[PDB]
Design a protein around this ligand. Structure first.
Ligand SMILES: Nc1ncnc2c1ncn2[C@@H]1O[C@H](CSCC[C@H](N)C(=O)O)[C@@H](O)[C@H]1O
Ligand SMILES: Cn1ncnc2c(=O)n(C)c(=O)nc1-2
Length: 241
């Protein structure tokens, strides 16, 4: 697992990157009220979203990550904060269902599907993890990002290259950390996302713009967010059966 070599540097990135506050705000906007819900947090990393979802009143939270090192970090945080989250090491593309939840949160899962066939398998696994009236809240790479239109290093993610891969693109990148931490991600097209969504059994879905807000603009020099708005690397997504 690539994040076995990143470990705590990812949390360092979340504390220094300008984009992270926008991601977090947008995701909690899409999630809404979590009181009493069962929640599955996929690609959970050290558990940030599932843990804050628990703190906001969720009934039960389970986290899944392909990285044994990241899950060991997640488990240690739960011990440190005395919280009841449970974690599993799995590749979400090939995992067996863990129950049916009110809410699946997948912040930075689908951009790690390394083929369009695995993108489709992931959406089917998510649908099988949902009750009929549940919902998926996802955060992923915007299909329209183009490396030539502007890099994202000033917001925290230095994208290094761009290469055709299957019907999409693959990108090497690094989180802007001390020292930088390398990873690779995949940019699948909007059509392929929407096809994977429909074929998994989600009859409703909507893309969600990142919630850049007035105070974000006020606390940087004018134009700081121009690349973020003109060549955004990220987008939200909500799906319902
Ligand atoms: N196929 C897969 N199945 C499960 N987890 C995966 C995966 N591919 C990548 N990941 C995990 O996805 C995580 C991306 S980092 C994002 C962590 C967390 N969602 C947060 O936003 O705070 C890493 O921990 C990585 O190991
Ligand atoms: C995990 N994670 N966290 C924050 N931001 C990103 C990101 O921009 N991209 C492109 C990405 O693949 N993964 C991210």
């Amino acid at each position: 697992a690539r994040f076995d070599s990143i470990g705590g540097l990812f949390e360092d990135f979340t504390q220094s990157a300008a984009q992270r506050a926008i991601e977090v705000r947008t995701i909690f906007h899409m999630i809404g009220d979590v009181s009493g819900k069962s929640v599955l947090d996929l690609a959970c990393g050290f558990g940030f979203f599932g843990r804050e979802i628990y703190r906001r009143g969720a009934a039960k939270v389970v986290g899944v990550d392909i990285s044994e090192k990241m899950i060991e970090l997640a488990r240690e945080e739960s011990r440190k904060y005395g919280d009841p989250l449970e974690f599993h090491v799995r590749d979400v593309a090939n995992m067996e269902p863990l129950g049916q939840f009110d809410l699946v949160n997948a912040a930075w899962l689908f951009n790690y599907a390394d083929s369009v066939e695995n993108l489709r398998k992931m959406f089917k696994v998510v649908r099988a993890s949902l009750k009929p009236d549940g919902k998926l809240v996802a955060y992923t790479v915007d299909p329209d990002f183009s490396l030539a239109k502007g890099n994202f290093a000033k917001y925290g993610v230095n994208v290094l290259n761009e290469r055709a891969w299957g019907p999409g693109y693959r990108h090497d990148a690094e989180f802007v950390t001390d020292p930088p931490s390398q990873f690779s991600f995949y940019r699948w097209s909007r059509a392929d996302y929407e096809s994977a969504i429909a074929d998994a059994g989600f009859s409703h879905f909507e893309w969600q713009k990142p919630l850049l807000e007035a105070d974000d603009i006020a606390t940087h020099p004018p134009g700081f967010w121009d690349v973020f708005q003109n060549n955004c690397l990220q987008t939200g997504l909500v799906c319902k059966p």
